[PDB]
C-alpha cells in the first residue's frame, strides 16, 4: 500500500447523516465492556477503528469507581473496528493518558503519553513496535489531541502541548516518519492557547481546530505546513462560536485573530471545517454544560468575524441528553474526502451521582451529498437501574 | 494543619520580594498550597497555587510570568517571589491551604476553597526611606 | 473571569437579630461556592463551602443557601464575635477563583 | 473480486435441507448475547453472514425491557458469520431501526435507515463508508426490506416504501444512481424478500393493506423499469389468511381475503411452480411449513401442494423469513431463514423480545423430517 | 491450495507425546464455556481445530441441565482452532446431531446429521453452503464418524450407518467431491457392525477402524479404496481388544475376520494403526467402564491374531479419572504423516450426580519418533464445586 496523500477534493456536503453508535453503556450493563473516556475515531484505508483512553478497567467491575481522573498509571488506549463495543478482547495498543493515532497509509502511528503530571514520556508506536520518545519539555502535563492525527505522504503530524492550562502554554507540531520524529516546529501565528486540536488534511496542508482552555470562546485554528513544516494559527471567525462555555448567540462575537476572551476560560474538544468562506461546525447545544450537541453551517463564518447567518443545522443529541468532546475524522470516499464526525456521549460522575463510574458511548456521522432527515441519538443508558 | 509565615517587608519598586510559609509536616501532599492577596482596601486576589503530588504550579492573569511559587517538602515550606515590585503590590499576602488535590486537564479543578490560612505577612512597596 | 459581588456592602445589624448578606455571580458557578468570615487585622477563616456545607469549625447560627448564580449566607443570632468583613468566593470549575468584595456585617445601634 | 452477476440458472430444489441455527436465546439464558429482530442471512462470495437489528443491548441486562418497540435511536445492524450468535464482540455496521445489507462481489453494501418517524434518513454504507443518504420522501416511517437486497453487475437494488408510496433505489457502490416509482398492479409493498433471477431481480413482499397473497415486484436492472402482481397460488403466502379450504388468489389484485396485516416471507419460481413457505397457524405466526405448489405461480386456482416440510411445527413461534441466495459451483441455490421469536407481547414470562433463526437450503439431493423451534425455556431464564 | 493426497510415508512413532488440552470444564465454572459432547480434531493444511456436538447452550446455564440426550434439534456442529475453548465467539457450523467434517486440501466439508430419529437428513457442507444432502435410508438414526472424514485428492469420504445398534445394521461409505456425493459402496467384507469410524488416511486408501455395538469386543477395521470405491473389512487381530467393554487381557482374544463374542454388544469410539505388523492402539484402562486411558504397541498385533506382547505403553489418563470417545486424526508433516489422537473427557451426568449437565473437556496427542516421558492429563474439573 502506498503512504495516504487526501489529494482529493473535499465531498460537497450539506449537513451529516448518522453512521454509527456503539451503545457501550448499554451493553455495559449485562457484559464485560471497557470503562473509557476521550474515545476518537480514525480510519485504515479499508475500515474504520474506534480508539478510546480506557481506564485500565470494565465497568461493572470494583476498579470503575474513582475512574473520573484522567491521568493514571492503567489508562491504555483501546482499539477495536469502529462499532465493536469495547469487550474484553479489545487490543490496548499502549500505555496512554492521552494520545492520538492515525493510519500513514501503510500501518498504524500510535503517540501514546504516560508517566508522572511533572515528567511524562510521550511514545511513538508505528506498525506496532516503539519507534521513539519524547520528554515533556516544559515539565506540566505533557498532553495530544485526543483524536486522530494526520499524515500526508507519510509524514504524520501531532499537536502536543505542554506547560499550564489556565494560562500561556507551550505548544509544538511534531512531524513524524514511519513512528521517528523527523521535525519539531513550535506554534507561530495568533492562536494564544491550543489544547486538544481535531486535525483533518487539507492537501496540501493539514488544518486543525482547537481548544482555547484560557482565553477564546472562539476556537483556535492551527494551520500546518507539510513540505516546509512551517505553522500559522489563528481562530474560528464564526460570530457563532464554537467553544463551551460561551456567550450565547445573541451577545457572543468573535476575532479572526484574537481569543475573544468572552467566557474565554475553560472549553470542550470540538471541531469546525471550512466550506469556501462558510464554516462547517459542531458544538453543545448549552453553552455553560455538555449538554447536547448541534451541527450547522456558518454562511462566510470561516471569513467573516460578523457572520451569525447559520443554515442546515442538525440536532445530534438534544439539548437534554449529555454529550462531550467530539472530533472531525476524515474518510477517503471514491472521489472526494469526506468530512465524518464523532461525538463522545459522557455519563457518570460527577454530573450523574447515580453511579460511581463515568465511561462513555459515542456515536458518529459522516458527511453527505445527498438529503437526510432528522433524529437525536442520545447515549441511552439508564443510570437509575444498572450498576452503581 | 498549621502554616506560619516570614515577618513584614518593605521593598523598592522594579525588585523582587520572597514570602516564605512554613506547613505542617505532610501539608504539601494532600492540599494545594496557594497565594491569596489582600490590598489595605481592598478584596481577597488569588494569585496561584501549587499542585500537592506533581508540585506543577498555576498562577493567575495578572500575575502569570512575574510571580514564582516553590515548595521543598524537606523544610515543608513554601516561596512566593513577586518580581517587579510597584506600589499596586502593597498588601498582606496569605498562604493558604487548598482543598483540591488534582487537576484533570478536561473537567478543571474541584474544590478550590481555602479551609486553612496563614497569619498573612504585610508586604508594602514604596521608594520612601 | 466569573464576576462575584456582594450586598448590601455594610449590612449594619444589632446584636441577637439575624443577619443574610446576598452573593451574586456573573453566571452559574452550580453549588461551587464558600463563604469567608475576616475580624479585622486576623486571616481570613472558611465557614461554607459547596454552597452549603459548614467548614469544621463553624457554629450552627451560620447557614449557607441558594444554588446557579445566587447565593445568601445566613447569621441566625449575631454574638459580638460575628461583626466581621464577609467574602464570597466560587470555585467552579477554573480559574480564577474570584473572591466577592465582601460586605462588612457593621453593629446597628442608635 | 468482479462484482456478482447470478447469471448461472438456479438448482433443481425438491425441498430444503437444514443449513445453521444459532440458539441465540438458549444461549442467552447464561452468556452476553444481543437483543435483536428482523434477522436475516447474505453471504459473501467466500461466506454467509447473519444480521439483525439489534435493540443497542444484550438480553440479560436492564435495556433489554420494552424491547418490543421496533424504532429506537439504538438500534444498530449487528452483523455476524452464520452461526457465530451475536455475543458483545459482534460489529454493529450502522445505526438501523429498519435495513437491509448485500455484498456487490466486492464488497458490503449497507442500507441504513435511521431518525424521527415523521423525518427518517436512509444511509448507504458501502465498503464500511457512508456512500450516500436519503430523506423520507413521505415523511412517515421511511423503511426497508428487513433482508438481503440483491446486486447484479455492481448495481444493488433495494426496495423501499414510505406512508403506499414505494421506490425502488439502483446503487451502485452506495451512490442512489437511479430511482423508480413501483409500477404495475402490487397495490402495498413491505418488506420485500428479494432474490437474483438474472437478468432481472424479483421479490416477493408482504401487502399490509389488503393482500392476503404477496405481492410480486419484478426488477429491470438493464432499464430500471419496475412491474408488479401477486403469487397466483390458491394457498396465499401472508398471515393472517383464510384458511386452505376457502382462500384464493389473483395474478393481479389483492386478494381482499384477510388482507390487512401481514408477515415478511417469501415464495420463488420454479417454472410454473411455485416454492413457498409461510406459518402453519392462518391468525398468528405460529409454527412454519414450505411446499411446492403445482403451477401454483402462473395459475391462480392452484391448491396442489407438493413437498410439504415442516421447519417448526404449530406449536412453535416463527416470525419473519426470507430466501436468500448462494451462489454454487453451477447453480443459484435458494436457502430461506426463519426468525424465531421470543418474549413479548405473547410471551408475558419474560420483559424482553428476541429472535433466534434457523437457516435452511435448497436440495436437489433427498431429506428427511424434523421440527427445529427456538428451543428457550422461557419460565427458567432471566424476566 | 491443491487437494490433500496424504501420499507421504507414516511417521516412525515410538509414542505419543501431548500436544493440546482445552480446559473448558475448568473454565466453564467462571466463563460462557459450550456444553459439547462427542468432540473431534481435523486439520486444514496451516492449523488444526476441534469440533464438537454443542448442546445448544453454555454450561452455566438452565438449558445445560438433561443434556445427556445425544439427539436434540439444538445440537450444533461446534468449530474452533485447537485449544480455543468452546466460548460463546464460536461458530455453529451446521445443525447437527451426529457429525463428521474434514479439509479437502481447498476447503472444510462437514457432514452434518439431523432430523426426526426415524427419518434423518445428512447435509454436506462444503466451502460454507450446503451442497448436497441425502436420507435416512433404514430411517432408524442415521449416523456418522463423530470425527474427521478423509479427503484424498478431492474425494472425500465418510462412513454412515442407519439401522438398529445391537443388531444388523447398513452401512453406507459416501465418497464426496467439493460436497456432491459421487457414489455411495455399500459394506462389504467380514465387519457385522460398523459404528463411529475413526478414520486416517492410508495413501493409496483410507481406513478406519470402527466400535462395534453388537458382537465383536474386537474392533472392526473397515478398508476403503478412492480410486474404484470398493469396501472390505475385518479386525483388529490384537488379542488385547480396543473396545469397551471387554474381558480382561488374561481372558480377552480376537480374531481377524469375526466379531470376537467375548462382551461384543456396546463400546466406545476409540483408534488403532497399523505399524506394518505391530498394531498401535488407545484404550480406556477400565474394561466395564470409560474409566482411565491408555495407549500401547502390540508386537504383530494388526496380522496376528494370539498377539498379546504391549510395548510402549503410556497412561492418557490414569484408571481413576473418566475418558469417553477418541479418535485419530492425521497431521502432515513435513516428510510424514504423523497420527495424533484426542481423548474426549466426560464429566457429569449420569456418572457424577453431583451435576445436572453433561459435557466434555479434551486432549490432544501426537505420535512422536522423539523420546517423551510421562504423566496424566485427566479433565482437572471439581464437580463438587461449580455450579450444579
Ligand atoms: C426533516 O429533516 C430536514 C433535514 O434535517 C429538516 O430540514 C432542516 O431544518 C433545519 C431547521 O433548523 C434547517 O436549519 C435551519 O436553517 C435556517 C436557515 O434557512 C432558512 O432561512 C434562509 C434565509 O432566509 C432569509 O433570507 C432569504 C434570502 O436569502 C429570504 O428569502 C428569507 O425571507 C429570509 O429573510 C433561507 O435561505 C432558507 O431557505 C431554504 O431552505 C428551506 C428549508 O429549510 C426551503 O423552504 C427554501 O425553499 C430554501 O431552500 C430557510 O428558509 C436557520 O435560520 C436555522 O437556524 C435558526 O434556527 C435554529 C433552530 O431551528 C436555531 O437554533 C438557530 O440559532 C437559528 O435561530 C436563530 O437565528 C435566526 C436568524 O437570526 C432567528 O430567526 C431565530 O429567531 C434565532 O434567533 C437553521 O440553521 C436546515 O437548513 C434544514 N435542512 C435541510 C437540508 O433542508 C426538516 O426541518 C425536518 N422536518 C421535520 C418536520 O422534522
Ligand atoms: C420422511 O421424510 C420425507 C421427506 O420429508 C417425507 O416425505 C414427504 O412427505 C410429505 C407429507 O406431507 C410430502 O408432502 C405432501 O405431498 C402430497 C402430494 O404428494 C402425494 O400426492 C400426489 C398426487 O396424488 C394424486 O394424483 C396422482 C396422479 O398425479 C394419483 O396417482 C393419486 O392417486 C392422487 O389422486 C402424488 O403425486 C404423490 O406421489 C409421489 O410421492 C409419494 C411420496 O410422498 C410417493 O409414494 C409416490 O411414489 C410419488 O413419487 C403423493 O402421493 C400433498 O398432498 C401433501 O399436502 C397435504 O398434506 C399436508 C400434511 O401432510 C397438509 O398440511 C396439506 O395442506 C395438504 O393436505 C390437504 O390437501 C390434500 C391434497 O394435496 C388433501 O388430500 C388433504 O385432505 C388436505 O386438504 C404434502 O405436500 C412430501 O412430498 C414428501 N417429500 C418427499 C421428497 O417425498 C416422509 O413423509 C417422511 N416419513 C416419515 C415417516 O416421517
Ligand atoms: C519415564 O518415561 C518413559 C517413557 O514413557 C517410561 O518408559 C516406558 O515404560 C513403560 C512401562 O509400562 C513401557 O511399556 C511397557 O513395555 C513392556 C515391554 O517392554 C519390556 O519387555 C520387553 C520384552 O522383554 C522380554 O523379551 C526380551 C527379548 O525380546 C527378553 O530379553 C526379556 O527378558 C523379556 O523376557 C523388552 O524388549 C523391553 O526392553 C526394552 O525396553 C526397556 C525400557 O522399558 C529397556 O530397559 C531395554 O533396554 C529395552 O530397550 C522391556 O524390558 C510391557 O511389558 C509393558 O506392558 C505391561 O505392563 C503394563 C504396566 O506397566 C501393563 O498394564 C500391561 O498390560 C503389561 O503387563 C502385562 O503383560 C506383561 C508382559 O508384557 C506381563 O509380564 C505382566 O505381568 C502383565 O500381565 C508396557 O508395554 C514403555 O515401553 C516405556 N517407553 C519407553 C519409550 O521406554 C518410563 O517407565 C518412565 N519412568 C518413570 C520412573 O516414570
Ligand atoms: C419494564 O418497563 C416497564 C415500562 O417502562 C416498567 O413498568 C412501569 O414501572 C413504573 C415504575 O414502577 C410504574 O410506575 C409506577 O406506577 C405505580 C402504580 O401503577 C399502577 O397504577 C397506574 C394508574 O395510573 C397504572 O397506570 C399502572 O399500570 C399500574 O396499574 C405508582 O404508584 C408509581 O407512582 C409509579 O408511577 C408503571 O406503572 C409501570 N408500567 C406499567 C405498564 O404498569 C417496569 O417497571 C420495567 N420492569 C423492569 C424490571 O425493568
Ligand atoms: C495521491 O495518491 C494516489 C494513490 O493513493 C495517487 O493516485 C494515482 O494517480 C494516477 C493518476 O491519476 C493513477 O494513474 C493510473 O495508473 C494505472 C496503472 O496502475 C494506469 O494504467 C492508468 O491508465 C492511470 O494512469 C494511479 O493509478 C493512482 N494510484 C492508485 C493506486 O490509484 C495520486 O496520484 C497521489 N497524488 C499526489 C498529488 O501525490
Ligand atoms: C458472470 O460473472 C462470472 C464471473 O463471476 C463470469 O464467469 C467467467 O466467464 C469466463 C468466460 O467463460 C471464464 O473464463 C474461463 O476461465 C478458465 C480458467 O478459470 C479458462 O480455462 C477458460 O479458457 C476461460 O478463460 C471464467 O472462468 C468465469 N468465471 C467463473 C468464476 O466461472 C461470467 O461470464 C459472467 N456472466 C455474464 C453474463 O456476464
Ligand atoms: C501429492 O501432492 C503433492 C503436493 O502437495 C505433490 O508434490 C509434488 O511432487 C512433485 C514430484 O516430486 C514435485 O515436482 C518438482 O517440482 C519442482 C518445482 O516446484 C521442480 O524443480 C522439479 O523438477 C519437480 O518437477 C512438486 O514440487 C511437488 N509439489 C509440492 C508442493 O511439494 C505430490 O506429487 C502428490 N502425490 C501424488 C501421489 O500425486
Ligand atoms: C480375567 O478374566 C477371567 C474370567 O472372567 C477371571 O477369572 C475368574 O476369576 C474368578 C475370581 O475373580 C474365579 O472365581 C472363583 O471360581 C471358583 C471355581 O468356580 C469358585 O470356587 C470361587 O468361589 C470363585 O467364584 C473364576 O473361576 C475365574 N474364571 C476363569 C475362567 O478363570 C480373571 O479373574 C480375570 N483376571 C483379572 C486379573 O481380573
Ligand atoms: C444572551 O446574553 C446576554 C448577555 O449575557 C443576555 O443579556 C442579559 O439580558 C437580561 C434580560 O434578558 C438582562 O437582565 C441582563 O442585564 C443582560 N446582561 C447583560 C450583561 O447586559 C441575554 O439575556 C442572553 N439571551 C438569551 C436569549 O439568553
Ligand atoms: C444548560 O444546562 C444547565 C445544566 O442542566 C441548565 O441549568 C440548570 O437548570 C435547572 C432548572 O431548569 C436547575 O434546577 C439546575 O440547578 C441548573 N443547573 C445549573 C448548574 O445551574 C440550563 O437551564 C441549560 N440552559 C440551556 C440554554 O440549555
Ligand atoms: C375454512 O374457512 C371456512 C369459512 O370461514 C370455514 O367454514 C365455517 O366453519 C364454521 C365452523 O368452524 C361454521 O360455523 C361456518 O358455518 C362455516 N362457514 C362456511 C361458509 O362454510 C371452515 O371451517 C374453515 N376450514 C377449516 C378446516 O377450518
Ligand atoms: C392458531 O393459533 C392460535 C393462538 O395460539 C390458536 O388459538 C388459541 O386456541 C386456544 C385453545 O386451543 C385458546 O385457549 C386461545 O385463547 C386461542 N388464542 C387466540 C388468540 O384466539 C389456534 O387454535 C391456532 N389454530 C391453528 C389452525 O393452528
Ligand atoms: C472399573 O471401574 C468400575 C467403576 O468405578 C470399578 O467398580 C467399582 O468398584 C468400587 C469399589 O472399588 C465399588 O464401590 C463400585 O460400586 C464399583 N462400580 C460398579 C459399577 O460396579 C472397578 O473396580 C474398576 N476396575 C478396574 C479393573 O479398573
Ligand atoms: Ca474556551
Ligand atoms: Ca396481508
Ligand atoms: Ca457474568
Ligand atoms: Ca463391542
Redesign the interface.
Given at each position: 500500500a502506498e503512504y495516504r496523500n487526501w489529494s482529493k477534493p473535499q465531498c460537497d456536503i450539506t449537513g451529516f447523516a448518522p453512521f454509527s453508535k456503539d451503545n457501550s453503556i448499554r451493553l455495559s450493563a449485562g457484559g464485560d465492556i471497557w470503562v473509557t473516556?476521550?474515545p476518537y475515531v480514525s480510519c485504515d484505508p479499508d475500515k474504520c477503528y474506534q480508539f478510546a483512553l480506557g481506564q485500565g478497567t470494565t465497568l461493572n467491575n470494583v476498579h470503575s469507581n474513582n475512574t473520573?481522573?484522567?491521568?493514571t498509571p492503567y489508562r491504555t488506549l483501546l482499539m477495536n473496528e469502529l462499532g465493536v463495543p469495547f469487550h474484553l478482547g479489545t487490543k490496548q495498543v499502549c500505555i496512554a493518558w492521552?494520545s492520538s493515532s492515525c493510519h500513514d497509509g501503510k500501518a498504524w502511528l500510535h503517540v501514546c503519553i504516560t508517566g508522572?503530571?511533572?515528567n511524562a514520556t510521550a511514545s511513538f508506536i508505528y506498525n506496532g513496535r516503539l519507534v521513539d520518545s519524547v520528554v515533556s519539555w516544559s515539565?506540566?502535563?505533557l498532553?495530544t489531541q485526543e483524536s486522530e492525527c494526520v499524515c500526508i505522504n507519510g509524514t504524520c503530524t501531532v499537536v502536543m502541548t505542554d506547560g499550564?492550562?489556565?494560562?500561556?502554554a507551550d505548544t509544538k507540531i511534531l512531524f513524524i516518519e514511519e513512528g521517528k520524529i523527523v521535525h519539531t516546529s513550535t506554534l507561530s501565528g495568533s492562536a494564544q492557547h491550543v489544547?486538544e486540536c481535531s486535525c483533518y488534511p487539507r492537501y496540501p496542508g493539514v488544518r486543525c481546530v482547537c481548544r482555547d482552555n484560557w482565553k477564546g470562546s472562539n476556537r483556535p485554528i492551527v494551520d500546518i505546513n507539510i513540505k516546509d513544516h512551517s505553522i500559522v494559527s489563528s481562530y474560528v471567525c464564526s460570530g457563532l462560536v464554537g467553544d463551551t462555555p460561551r456567550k450565547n448567540d445573541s451577545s457572543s462575537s468573535s476575532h479572526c485573530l484574537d481569543p475573544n476572551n468572552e467566557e474565554g476560560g475553560?472549553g470542550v474538544?470540538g471541531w469546525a471545517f471550512d466550506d469556501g468562506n462558510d464554516v462547517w461546525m459542531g458544538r453543545t447545544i448549552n453553552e455553560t454544560s455538555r449538554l447536547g450537541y448541534e451541527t450547522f453551517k456558518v454562511i462566510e463564518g470561516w471569513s467573516n468575524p460578523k457572520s451569525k447567518l447559520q443554515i442546515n443545522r442538525q440536532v445530534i443529541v438534544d439539548r437534554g441528553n449529555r454529550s462531550g468532546?467530539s472530533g472531525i475524522f476524515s474518510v477517503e470516499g471514491k472521489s472526494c474526502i469526506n468530512r465524518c464526525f464523532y461525538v463522545e456521549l459522557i455519563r457518570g460522575r460527577?454530573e450523574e451521582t447515580e453511579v460511581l463510574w463515568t465511561s462513555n458511548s459515542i456515536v458518529v456521522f459522516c458527511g453527505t451529498s445527498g438529503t437526510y432527515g432528522t433524529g437525536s441519538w442520545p447515549d441511552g443508558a439508564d443510570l437509575n437501574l444498572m450498576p452503581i | 494543619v498549621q502554616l506560619v509565615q516570614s515577618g513584614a517587608e518593605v521593598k523598592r519598586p522594579g525588585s523582587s520580594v520572597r514570602v516564605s510559609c512554613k506547613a505542617s509536616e505532610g501539608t504539601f501532599n494532600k492540599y494545594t498550597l496557594t497565594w491569596?492577596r489582600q490590598a489595605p482596601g481592598?478584596?481577597?486576589?488569588?494569585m496561584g497555587g501549587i499542585?500537592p503530588?506533581?508540585?506543577?504550579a498555576?498562577?493567575?492573569?495578572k500575575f502569570?510570568?512575574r510571580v514564582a511559587i516553590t515548595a521543598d517538602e524537606s523544610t515543608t515550606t513554601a516561596y512566593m517571589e513577586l518580581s517587579s515590585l510597584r506600589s499596586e503590590d502593597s498588601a498582606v499576602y496569605?498562604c493558604?491551604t487548598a482543598?483540591?488535590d488534582?487537576?484533570?486537564?478536561?473537567?478543571?479543578?474541584?474544590?478550590?476553597?481555602?479551609?486553612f490560612?496563614?497569619?498573612?505577612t504585610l508586604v508594602t512597596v514604596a521608594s520612601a526611606s | 473571569?466569573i464576576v462575584m459581588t456582594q450586598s448590601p456592602a455594610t449590612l449594619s445589624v444589632s446584636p441577637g437579630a439575624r443577619a443574610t448578606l446576598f452573593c451574586r455571580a456573573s453566571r452559574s458557578v452550580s453549588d461551587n461556592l464558600?463563604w469567608?468570615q475576616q475580624k479585622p487585622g486576623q486571616?481570613?477563616?472558611?465557614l461554607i463551602?459547596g454552597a452549603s456545607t459548614r467548614?469544621?469549625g463553624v457554629p450552627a447560627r451560620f447557614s449557607g443557601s441558594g444554588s446557579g448564580t445566587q447565593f445568601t449566607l445566613t447569621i441566625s443570632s449575631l454574638q459580638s464575635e460575628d461583626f466581621a468583613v464577609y467574602?464570597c468566593?466560587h470555585?467552579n470549575?477554573?480559574?480564577?477563583?474570584?473572591?466577592?468584595?465582601?460586605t462588612k456585617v457593621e453593629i446597628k445601634r442608635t
Amino acid at each position: 500500500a502506498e503512504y495516504r496523500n487526501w489529494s482529493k477534493p473535499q465531498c460537497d456536503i450539506t449537513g451529516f447523516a448518522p453512521f454509527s453508535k456503539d451503545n457501550s453503556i448499554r451493553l455495559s450493563a449485562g457484559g464485560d465492556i471497557w470503562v473509557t473516556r476521550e474515545p476518537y475515531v480514525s480510519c485504515d484505508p479499508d475500515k474504520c477503528y474506534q480508539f478510546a483512553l480506557g481506564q485500565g478497567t470494565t465497568l461493572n467491575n470494583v476498579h470503575s469507581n474513582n475512574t473520573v481522573r484522567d491521568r493514571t498509571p492503567y489508562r491504555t488506549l483501546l482499539m477495536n473496528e469502529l462499532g465493536v463495543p469495547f469487550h474484553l478482547g479489545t487490543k490496548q495498543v499502549c500505555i496512554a493518558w492521552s494520545s492520538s493515532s492515525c493510519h500513514d497509509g501503510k500501518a498504524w502511528l500510535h503517540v501514546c503519553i504516560t508517566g508522572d503530571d511533572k515528567n511524562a514520556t510521550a511514545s511513538f508506536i508505528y506498525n506496532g513496535r516503539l519507534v521513539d520518545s519524547v520528554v515533556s519539555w516544559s515539565k506540566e502535563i505533557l498532553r495530544t489531541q485526543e483524536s486522530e492525527c494526520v499524515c500526508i505522504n507519510g509524514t504524520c503530524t501531532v499537536v502536543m502541548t505542554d506547560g499550564s492550562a489556565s494560562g500561556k502554554a507551550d505548544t509544538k507540531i511534531l512531524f513524524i516518519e514511519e513512528g521517528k520524529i523527523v521535525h519539531t516546529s513550535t506554534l507561530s501565528g495568533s492562536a494564544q492557547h491550543v489544547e486538544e486540536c481535531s486535525c483533518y488534511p487539507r492537501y496540501p496542508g493539514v488544518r486543525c481546530v482547537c481548544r482555547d482552555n484560557w482565553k477564546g470562546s472562539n476556537r483556535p485554528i492551527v494551520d500546518i505546513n507539510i513540505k516546509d513544516h512551517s505553522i500559522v494559527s489563528s481562530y474560528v471567525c464564526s460570530g457563532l462560536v464554537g467553544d463551551t462555555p460561551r456567550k450565547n448567540d445573541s451577545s457572543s462575537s468573535s476575532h479572526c485573530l484574537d481569543p475573544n476572551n468572552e467566557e474565554g476560560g475553560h472549553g470542550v474538544k470540538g471541531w469546525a471545517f471550512d466550506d469556501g468562506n462558510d464554516v462547517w461546525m459542531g458544538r453543545t447545544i448549552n453553552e455553560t454544560s455538555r449538554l447536547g450537541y448541534e451541527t450547522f453551517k456558518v454562511i462566510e463564518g470561516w471569513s467573516n468575524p460578523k457572520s451569525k447567518l447559520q443554515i442546515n443545522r442538525q440536532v445530534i443529541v438534544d439539548r437534554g441528553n449529555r454529550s462531550g468532546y467530539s472530533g472531525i475524522f476524515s474518510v477517503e470516499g471514491k472521489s472526494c474526502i469526506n468530512r465524518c464526525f464523532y461525538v463522545e456521549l459522557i455519563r457518570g460522575r460527577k454530573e450523574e451521582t447515580e453511579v460511581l463510574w463515568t465511561s462513555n458511548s459515542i456515536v458518529v456521522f459522516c458527511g453527505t451529498s445527498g438529503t437526510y432527515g432528522t433524529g437525536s441519538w442520545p447515549d441511552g443508558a439508564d443510570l437509575n437501574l444498572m450498576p452503581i | 494543619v498549621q502554616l506560619v509565615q516570614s515577618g513584614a517587608e518593605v521593598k523598592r519598586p522594579g525588585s523582587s520580594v520572597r514570602v516564605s510559609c512554613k506547613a505542617s509536616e505532610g501539608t504539601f501532599n494532600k492540599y494545594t498550597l496557594t497565594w491569596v492577596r489582600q490590598a489595605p482596601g481592598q478584596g481577597l486576589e488569588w494569585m496561584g497555587g501549587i499542585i500537592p503530588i506533581s508540585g506543577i504550579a498555576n498562577y493567575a492573569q495578572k500575575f502569570q510570568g512575574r510571580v514564582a511559587i516553590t515548595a521543598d517538602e524537606s523544610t515543608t515550606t513554601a516561596y512566593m517571589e513577586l518580581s517587579s515590585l510597584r506600589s499596586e503590590d502593597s498588601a498582606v499576602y496569605y498562604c493558604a491551604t487548598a482543598v483540591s488535590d488534582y487537576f484533570n486537564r478536561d473537567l478543571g479543578w474541584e474544590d478550590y476553597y481555602f479551609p486553612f490560612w496563614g497569619q498573612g505577612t504585610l508586604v508594602t512597596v514604596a521608594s520612601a526611606s | 473571569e466569573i464576576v462575584m459581588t456582594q450586598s448590601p456592602a455594610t449590612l449594619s445589624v444589632s446584636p441577637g437579630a439575624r443577619a443574610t448578606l446576598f452573593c451574586r455571580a456573573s453566571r452559574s458557578v452550580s453549588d461551587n461556592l464558600a463563604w469567608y468570615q475576616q475580624k479585622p487585622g486576623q486571616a481570613p477563616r472558611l465557614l461554607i463551602f459547596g454552597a452549603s456545607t459548614r467548614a469544621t469549625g463553624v457554629p450552627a447560627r451560620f447557614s449557607g443557601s441558594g444554588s446557579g448564580t445566587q447565593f445568601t449566607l445566613t447569621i441566625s443570632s449575631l454574638q459580638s464575635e460575628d461583626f466581621a468583613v464577609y467574602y464570597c468566593q466560587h470555585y467552579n470549575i477554573w480559574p480564577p477563583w474570584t473572591f466577592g468584595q465582601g460586605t462588612k456585617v457593621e453593629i446597628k445601634r442608635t
